[PDB]
Write a protein that binds this ligand. Structure first.
Ligand SMILES: COC(=O)c1c(C(F)F)nc(C(F)(F)F)c(C(=O)O)c1CC(C)C
Length: 134
């Protein structure tokens, strides 16, 4: 077992706040904001050895990343940014930093009660997206 295993499973989005504003700050265009903002993703998190896989599945896109904690990787995001990503596990929180074009956004994933809470930050704008087990 590992501490990280409280994230493993299949999660469904139950609430979102300020996601349109977060996407605007990231630079997402109008049409993608509208369709992606309507999405109700499931988040599938699995661990096999040192490799963590996180999939976001929705009517908009199916996206999947696999990574080792602390080891940078190239990621194509749902809005088609080509970013350099590093994910670490710091005090029980998965911290995902994406770098591109001299910009940075950080996505934190935390367990709180029976929720998995995703906090997304860009240039002072936060979105909070709350998931529960499927
Ligand atoms: C900048 O926004 C994104 O990168 C993004 C977009 C959007 F860019 F298209 N759409 C979606 C989804 F709702 F469509 F799934 C997600 C998501 O996984 O929730 C994300 C990831 C984000 C919550 C950190």
């Amino acid at each position: 077992g590992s501490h990280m295993d409280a994230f493993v499973g299949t999660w469904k989005l139950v609430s979102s706040e300020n996601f349109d504003d977060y996407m605007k700050e990231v630079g997402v265009g109008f049409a993608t904001r509208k369709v992606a903002g309507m999405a109700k993703p499931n988040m599938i998190i699995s661990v096999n050895g040192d490799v963590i896989t996180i999939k976001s599945e929705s009517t908009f896109k199916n996206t999947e990343i696999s990574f080792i904690l602390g080891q940078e990787f190239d990621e194509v995001t749902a809005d088609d940014r080509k970013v350099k990503s590093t994910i670490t596990l710091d005090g029980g929180v998965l911290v995902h930093v994406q770098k591109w074009d001299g910009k940075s956004t950080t996505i934190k994933r935390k367990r709180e009660d029976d929720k998995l809470v995703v906090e997304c930050v860009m240039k002072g704008v936060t979105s909070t997206r709350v998931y529960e087990r499927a």
